[PDB]
């Protein structure tokens, strides 16, 4: 009997001061707000119903109307920022936090969900949820000896809401809130449900997207080996955030990068750098470029794991955005590597696919490649073998592309090409 | 996704 | 050398 009511009829029932009439009309609003297409969120807001729903959250003696209003407000808060703000403006944040302690699991779960939508809107509402004290009661719901005893749907919703408390920047979440959540997140990252694992990895990826000190708070909890394990999962929704987190970590110090290498991550890169999902190859190549920006002993582990041929492969054929990350990986490698390491790059076949990418109408990748060539020549100088390299560049059509770039518009580009020609080709 | 609507 | 450029 609560199917497809008009907003007018919902209002009439909610304004009746008969609690059971109010319950039926609130369920009718919940069903409207739950429909597949175009839920009438603005019309419900415009009818003035949010304050009434918020007061219903407080009706301990009518748990059904607490549930129905919590679900209705969850779905309003699922909308635009302005729609979420209307829920926050009605006083919903403290009312939902109070429902976290509900003895009815389905009501506590709905309050978890609503707070996830609020916090997920952005940094300010995230921080406002934290200031109203959401973290303690959320974490208390997970304080069980074995997460396997919780209902799977309930645990997934908690994990997702915690990941929204970790999400967003400018500012990043308060340091003390992150320290408070992290031990529970570490435990969720070891749980066996694929959706819990994915959202735990997303949360970790948000917390490592930041300066070195934020990375260190995570790395010090010892999660890198579990992240590397998940990097090999068969589920793409797990691999994607695990790889984003690993990539964020290797943007940190060389010691943080070494923990990634120590845990075995490089052995997964033959598959990641050939992965059929373009986004995975791109993120894996970006991650490789931050590893080849490391120490010579880290470059050497890239060599030992057989990854330079995989970088030649991606430079030769990949989505253009991936090829650009590969060009960066090569310039970083040639900037930091030993003479022997750089020589090895040439023996693996780097020169021809590098030259072919000089036809790209992207100015910064051209700058990147020209820098690499110069670095490779400098290594060749120290061995007295620049002429061998010049001929290599000439035989594959590279000298033509470099000469043509002397007449390229970008002054940084034509200066670099002029120097190369002047220095090694005449 | 940042936000989720409960449909059922 | 490091690039926070995802």
Author numbering:
A (entry chain B): 72 to 497
B (entry chain D): 1165 to 1172
C (entry chain E): 1166 to 1171
Please quote the paper that reports this structure.
To gain molecular insights into TNRC6A localisation, we have determined the structure of Impα in complex with the TNRC6A cNLS. Orthorhombic crystals were obtained of mImpα1ΔIBB in complex with TNRC6A cNLS (residues 1164–1172 of the mouse protein corresponding to residues 1179–1187 of the human protein) isomorphous to previously determined mImpα1ΔIBB:cNLS structures. TNRC6A residues Gly1165-Arg1172 could be built unambiguously into strong difference density located at the mImpα1 major binding site. The peptide binds in an extended conformation, with basic side chains interacting with the Impα binding pockets. The TNRC6A cNLS binds to the Impα surface such that all 5 basic side chains are located at positions P1-P5 of the major binding site, highly similar to the SV40 TAg monopartite cNLS. In this binding register, TNRC6A Lys1167 (Lys1182 in hTNRC6A) is termed the critical P2 lysine forming a salt bridge with Asp192 of mImpα1. At the same time, Arg1168 in the P3 position forms a salt-bridge with Asp270 on the mImpα surface. More specifically, Arg1169 at the P4 pocket contacts the mImpα mainchain in the loop between ARM repeats 1 and 2 (Arg106-Glu107) that causes a shift in the Cα backbone when compared to cNLS bound structures that contain smaller residues, including lysine, at that position. The TNRC6A Arg1170 side chain is projected into the P5 cavity that is lined by Trp142 and Trp184, interacting with Gln181 at the end of the mImpα P5 pocket. At the minor binding-site, TNRC6A cNLS residues Lys1166-Glu1171 could be built into difference density maps located at mImpα1 ARM repeats 6–8.
